[PDB]
């Protein structure tokens, strides 16, 4: 979805250095402030918040 849109490719060139594999490891990384933001599906985030 961020690869198709030609005006959102730059963030793609950020996220190619930082993408992860599971949601829970990203939750733990942003939980201890190892990350600083997390773009994700709204239902999973509204559940875990």
């Amino acid at each position: 979805y961020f690869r198709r849109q030609v005006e959102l490719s730059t963030m793609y060139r950020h996220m190619e250095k930082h993408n992860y594999e599971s949601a829970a490891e990203a939750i733990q990384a942003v939980r201890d402030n190892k990350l600083h933001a997390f773009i994700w599906d709204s239902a999973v985030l509204e559940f875990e918040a």
């Binding site: 979805y1 773009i39 994700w40 709204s42 509204e46």
Partner: protein
């Protein structure tokens, strides 16, 4: 990390109850397995032959190892060109998680 560690496991929650509702309504049994990685599935070129591949859930689907994907499956144009979808059951968007 794990070369081969597959044990029988207990799966439950939302979509499992959806599948139980479908097997209650439509007359069929099933056998739930999971995917062999942690990827939904994208459109990636393999090393040679100039050929695209789909990995993940579409990878185990289009290889014939599955017949129905019941998952948080995001509907887009690319997957719908290759597999058919049903009508959605839960609507969302995209947002940010902060502290």
């Amino acid at each position: 990390g794990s070369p081969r560690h597959t044990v029988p496991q207990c799966c439950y929650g939302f979509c499992i109850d959806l599948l139980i509702k479908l097997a209650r309504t439509m007359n069929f049994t099933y056998e739930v397995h999971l995917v062999a990685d942690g990827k939904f599935g994208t459109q990636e070129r393999v090393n040679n032959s100039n050929k695209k591949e789909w990995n993940g859930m579409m990878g185990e689907l289009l290889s014939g190892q599955a017949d129905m994907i019941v998952a948080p499956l995001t509907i887009n144009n690319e997957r719908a060109q290759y597999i058919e979808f049903s009508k959605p059951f839960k609507y969302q968007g995209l947002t940010i998680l902060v502290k």
